[PDB]
Amino acid sequence: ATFEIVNRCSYTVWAAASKGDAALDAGGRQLNSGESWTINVEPGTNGGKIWARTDCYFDDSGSGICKTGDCGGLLRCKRFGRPPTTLAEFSLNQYGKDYIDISNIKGFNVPMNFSPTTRGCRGVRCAADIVGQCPAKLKAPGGGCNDACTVFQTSEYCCTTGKCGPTEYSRFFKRLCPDAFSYVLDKPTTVTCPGSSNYRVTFCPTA
């Protein structure tokens, strides 16, 4: 499947793509304002994610640090990034269907639009100013708005036992972005698309 990733933000983002135990494609790349990066992802990839990183500093060897979404100090991510991170998540060709969602379960850093570029399903978006409105206890000094698991590490916020309810923090994310997952057991806002669809991940879709 082909994903085009578009930075429409007025600042540089360092895009990342991983399935947790492997890079997707190059795994990561600088995207200045307006730049686009097309990547291939294998059919059948299950549990892929795409996100943005902010305020990175990297050397000529591809090693360094980002203030959000850092994946162990690498440019070319092999693993998932450190919260907070708005998440494009995808499992493709699963019994003939592709599954897409935006998650706020690991917090929010950059607004995002995650849409097909082929026929037969709809896209989803989280574009509200979550960072401006973030509750003071969730605000990440590096930038972004952490989720409450990250901040407090309780069974209720991390849905440890598999029973958890919505919380004052989850409802904050949900009020601003209804179409994104706000906690582990939220009513699904997964979209079902035809198997082997293509897509567009855009950072700052309304800016």
Swiss-Prot record:
Primary location: cytoplasm
Keyword annotations: Cytoplasmic vesicle, Disulfide bond, Signal, Taste-modifying protein
Keyword Transit peptide in annotation: no
Source species, domain of life: Eukaryota
Protein's UniProt keywords contain Protease: no
Cystine residue pairs: 9-204, 56-66, 71-77, 121-193, 126-177, 134-145, 149-158, 159-164
Name of the molecule in the record: Thaumatin I
PANTHER family the record matches: OS03G0233200 PROTEIN
Annotated localization: Cytoplasmic vesicle
Family affiliation: Belongs to the thaumatin family.
Role played: Taste-modifying protein; intensely sweet-tasting. It is 100000 times sweeter than sucrose on a molar basis.
Gene Ontology cellular component terms for the protein in this record: cytoplasmic vesicle
Xref: Pfam families: Thaumatin
InterPro entries referenced in this protein's UniProt entry, alphabetically: Osmotin/thaumatin-like_sf, Thaumatin, Thaumatin_CS
